[PDB]
Design a protein around this nucleic acid. Sequence first.
DNA 1: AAAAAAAAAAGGCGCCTATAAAAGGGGTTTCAATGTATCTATAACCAGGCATAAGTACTAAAGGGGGTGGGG
Length: 63
Amino acid sequence: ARARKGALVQCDPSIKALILQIDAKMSDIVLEELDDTHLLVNPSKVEFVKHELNRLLSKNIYN
DNA sequence: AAAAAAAAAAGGCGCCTATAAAAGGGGTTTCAATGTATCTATAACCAGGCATAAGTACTAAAGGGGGTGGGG
């Protein structure tokens, strides 16, 4: 009966957890948790999330 | 004392030895060199047992440099 625009993000559970951590810090990122591997995210924040994930993973001093 | 059987002995018969010289054939009996199965000393064969040399992996060591994380 209702539709809303957004960006669907499909990712592994560990990445889902990381995006939730990003949201908790920055807010206004995650619109809905959909399932263990899917989120609805603010479309204007998708590139931010992708860049931040890359930084979190690639720049980790314990790599 | 007698008849009887068993025994040793004799006499006789036959053939042997050494003598002799000289013409053709067939017999059995013993001994010659040349070979199978079995023997001998030799040479050569396997498997099994002990000692020495070569190769193994193993543990064994010490010496250092570089990168990442934590603390000041």
